[PDB]
Amino acid sequence: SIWSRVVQFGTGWGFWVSGHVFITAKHVAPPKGTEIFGRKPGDFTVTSSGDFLKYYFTSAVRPDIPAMVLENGCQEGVVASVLVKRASGEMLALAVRMGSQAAIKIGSAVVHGQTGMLLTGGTIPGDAGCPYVYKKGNTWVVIGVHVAATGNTVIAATHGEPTLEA
């Protein structure tokens, strides 16, 4: 069901956080100016940080879904899931122990994101944009989008202002 929020997008995948909010890896997204989901620029606004790309649509695109919480990464040691879809429609929930912050070259330049360790009981380059999620008690929470793999290590791009200020 949460899997219906994961859809193909550009050269990778993206994730519906809510009916109005779509997130993806910037490096797989269609060019700025492209019509998406039958919507023209103007009907949506685009924000980016590093390899994190976020679309906000004025009118809901997926009215069938509730808003999920979007956090800026998670605590170290948290075991999250990478919701990997393949073009065949296959669904692979990859367990990942979230780690600390690293950088990596992605195309033109260097982005920064939260590393993670793929747990065995991996990813391929067309998996970029798939969501990292975890259950916080009763609530599913999205913490970022898949950017790249390494040798066991994955990187997630993150985004979001924490509710509480210092």
Author numbering: 4 to 124, 133 to 161, 164 to 179
From the paper:
Whereas ORF2, ORF3 and ORF4 each encode single proteins, ORF1 codes for a large polyprotein (∼190 kDa) that is processed by the virally-encoded protease at five specific sites to release the six ‘mature’ non-structural proteins (NS1/2–NS7)—and an array of functional precursors—that are required for virus replication. The viral NS6 protease present within the C-terminal half of the polyprotein performs all the processing, including its own autocatalytic release from the precursor. Norovirus NS6 is a cysteine protease with a chymotrypsin-like fold: two β-barrel domains separated by a cleft that contains a Cys-His-Asp/Glu catalytic triad similar in arrangement to the Ser-His-Asp triad characteristic of serine proteases. To this end we extended an inactive MNV NS6 construct (which incorporates a C139A mutation to knock out the active site nucleophile) by adding residues from NS7, which is immediately downstream in the polyprotein.
We made three constructs, NS6 1′, NS6 2′ and NS6 4′, which were extended by 1, 2 and 4 residues respectively, generating proteases that contain substrates that correspond to P4–P1′, P4-P2′ and P4-P4′ of the NS6–NS7 cleavage junction. MNV NS6 4′ crystallised in space group C2 but in a unit cell that is very different from the C2 crystals obtained with MNV NS6 1′ and that has only one molecule in the asymmetric unit. The electron density was sufficient to build a model that starts at residue 4 and ends at residue 179. Although the extended C-terminus of NS6 once again reaches between loops bII-cII and eII-fII of its near neighbour, the relation between the two molecules does not involve two-fold or quasi two-fold symmetry. However, no specific contacts are made by the C-terminal peptide with the substrate binding site.
